[PDB]
Paper text:
To provide a definitive insight into the importance of N-glycosylation on the structure and activity of human hCES1, the crystal structure of the enzyme with the mutation, N79Q, has been determined. The structure-function relationship of this aglycosylated hCES1 was explored alongside the wild type enzyme and a catalytically inactive mutant (S221A). The yields of the aglycosylated hCES1 N79Q, glycosylated hCES1 and S221A enzymes were 39 mg/L, 64 mg/L and 68 mg/L respectively showing that N-glycosylation is not required for expression and secretion of the enzyme consistent with previous results. As expected, the mobility of the N79Q protein was not altered by PNGase treatment. Activity increased linearly with enzyme concentration and the specific activities for hCES1 and for hCES1 N79Q were 73 µmol min-1 μg-1, 98 µmol min-1 μg-1 respectively. A comparison of authentically glycosylated human hCES1 produced in HEK cells with an aglycosylated version of the enzyme shows that preventing glycosylation at N79 does not affect the synthesis, activity or structure of the enzyme.
Carboxylesterases are a family of enzymes that act on a variety of both exogenous (e.g. cocaine, heroin) and endogenous (e.g. acyl-CoA esters) substrates. Carboxylesterases comprise three distinct domains; a central domain containing the catalytic triad (S221, H467 and E354), a regulatory domain (RD) and an α/β domain.
Author numbering: 22 to 552
Write the structure that this text describes.
């Protein structure tokens, strides 16, 4: 259009897009490779640097999304996209690409902050391309980078030993950050000011990166949105071997040894590993035999390269990256989106005590709560009322609190206590972009803040004046944090540091400061889990 940039491995050609209210068009570069494609023998291995190219690579097409269930993937991209229209993507193992939105005049001198987005989808689905960086980049003058990383089996297959350690997806995330360091100056970005941010499994990934020595000097601020390293559904402790064996059997491989399982899986076609994925029935709750065996996903493991010990132990040791860290959550993290996606046994308008307890047990993959604690937990949340419709609501508050609220505050506290500037928020607002099938009473569902962070009101239609102003404020807070490690700025509500007083920001129509986010839930669960 005609912007051409030279990266360490060769030239790329992007295009210009203008945003209303902004004279300088944003230069967009789609499908830049940050690694060699992880094919054949490179499956279940760390990413390798991309091979160099001659001439000018076209970076004007969205790349494929990493192999995943196309039905769940597209459904998630549709619900999370900040675009007027979702962009249908192709599936491939050839998926280690990133997309760049730089608002800089590349003919001129620039050294802008860089915000690197890591999408969610439970480490099983999701895509970079779902997220248009155009609005955030233009409104706040930051270079926005969206990254992809291997998912499901390809991303996280682990034998628990040196033949397939696992965490390939997080290695990709790290690879993308090294690429950013080595390249982003050519896109008008500052490699001394990188902010990583992510939502759900993306937030968990940011939290895990904060804890990993591999990610040292790769970023200078971090934001986890509705997900952290103590969101226990995404982090496998204990023996991963049974899972590995069930996958290899489902793939039609023998289990004689680890190295033999890995070699046999490496001979399978993309199509065969996808078939296997669909038969494992991940992102779904198994209603058979034991909840303690049911696997809704595989995910982060303690591999000895990325993570040396469990997040719990690493926090106590305080060896992690003490960068400024914003950790936040939404008011009803389990209000609609997540249960709808797993076809959760939620159906009736109400719910009694005894079902609650068996549901919670079958929910073990999500909440990771032993059977002896289940009566107490349910009584705690559901016992103060005989009203079965309010039982249902308290129950979703329960799951939300265990999955996100409590882990988040714990992470934030530990990060504060290590000596790092820490911020927290709780987001409470119901976007007009919400799916029509979500009840109007669900407010601050999982993902609801995305529309503000990415500026859906500037790209989709139908936004009120209130919704518009809400996005402008969220983006300015996010980018102020990227600039300064501190979201505050003149014109914005005061956001207190998450210090000994535990100030945090209630973000929504009426944005204001408060204190001790989830204090009583944290005490309750912690005391209960140490029984």
């Amino acid at each position: 259009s005609p912007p051409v940039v030279d990266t360490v491995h060769g030239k790329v050609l992007g295009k210009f897009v203008s945003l209303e209210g902004f004279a300088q068009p944003v230069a967009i570069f789609l499908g830049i490779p940050f690694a060699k494609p992880p094919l054949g023998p490179l499956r279940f291995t760390p990413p390798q640097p991309a091979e160099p190219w001659s001439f000018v690579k076209q970076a004007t097409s969205y790349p494929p999304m990493c192999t995943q269930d196309p039905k769940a993937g597209q459904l998630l991209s549709e619900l999370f996209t900040n675009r007027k229209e979702n962009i249908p993507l192709k599936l491939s193992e050839d998926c280690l690409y990133l997309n760049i939105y730089t608002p800089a005049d590349l003919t001129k001198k620039n050294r802008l902050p860089v915000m690197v987005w890591i999408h969610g989808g439970g480490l099983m689905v999701g895509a970079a391309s779902t997220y248009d960086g155009l609005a955030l980049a233009a409104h706040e003058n930051v270079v926005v980078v969206t990254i992809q990383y291997r998912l499901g089996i390809w991303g996280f297959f682990s034998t628990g030993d040196e033949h397939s350690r696992g965490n390939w997806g997080h290695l990709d995330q790290v690879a993308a950050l090294r690429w950013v360091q080595d390249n982003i100056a050519s896109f008008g970005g500052n490699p001394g000011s990188v902010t990583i941010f992510g939502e759900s499994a993306g937030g968990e990934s940011v939290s895990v990166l904060v804890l990993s020595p591999l990610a040292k000097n790769l970023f200078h601020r971090a934001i986890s949105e509705s997900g952290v390293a103590l969101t226990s559904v995404l982090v496998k402790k204990g023996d991963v071997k049974p899972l590995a064996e069930q996958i290899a059997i489902t793939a039609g491989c023998k289990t004689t040894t680890s190295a033999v399982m890995v070699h046999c899986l490496r001979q399978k076609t993309e199509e065969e590993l996808l078939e296997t994925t669909l038969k494992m029935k991940f992102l779904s709750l198994d209603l058979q035999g034991d909840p303690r065996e049911s696997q809704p996903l595989l995910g982060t493991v303690i591999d000895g390269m990325l993570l040396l010990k469990t997040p719990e132990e690493l926090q106590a040791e305080r060896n992690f990256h003490t960068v400024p860290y914003m950790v936040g959550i939404n008011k009803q993290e389990f209000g609609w989106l997540i249960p709808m996606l797993m076809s959760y046994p939620l159906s009736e308008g109400q719910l009694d005590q005894k079902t609650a307890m068996s549901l919670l047990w079958k929910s073990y993959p999500l909440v990771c709560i032993a059977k002896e604690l289940i009566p107490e937990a349910t009584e705690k949340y559901l016992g103060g009322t005989d009203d079965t419709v309010k039982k249902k609501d308290l129950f979703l508050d329960l799951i939300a609190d265990v999955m996100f609220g409590v882990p988040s505050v714990i992470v934030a506290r530990n990060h504060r206590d290590a000596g790092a500037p820490t911020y927290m928020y709780e987001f409470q607002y119901r976007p007009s972009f919400s799916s029509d099938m979500k009840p109007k009473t669900v407010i601050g569902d999982h993902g609801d803040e995305l529309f503000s962070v990415f500026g859906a009101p500037f790209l989709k239609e139908g936004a009120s004046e209130e919704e518009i102003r809400l996005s402008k404020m969220v983006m300015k807070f996010w980018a102020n944090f990227a600039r300064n490690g501190n979201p505050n700025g003149e014109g914005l509500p005061h956001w207190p540091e998450y210090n000994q007083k535990e100030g945090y920001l209630q973000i929504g129509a009426n944005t204001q400061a408060a204190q001790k986010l989830k204090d009583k839930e944290v005490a309750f669960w912690t005391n209960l889990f140490a029984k």
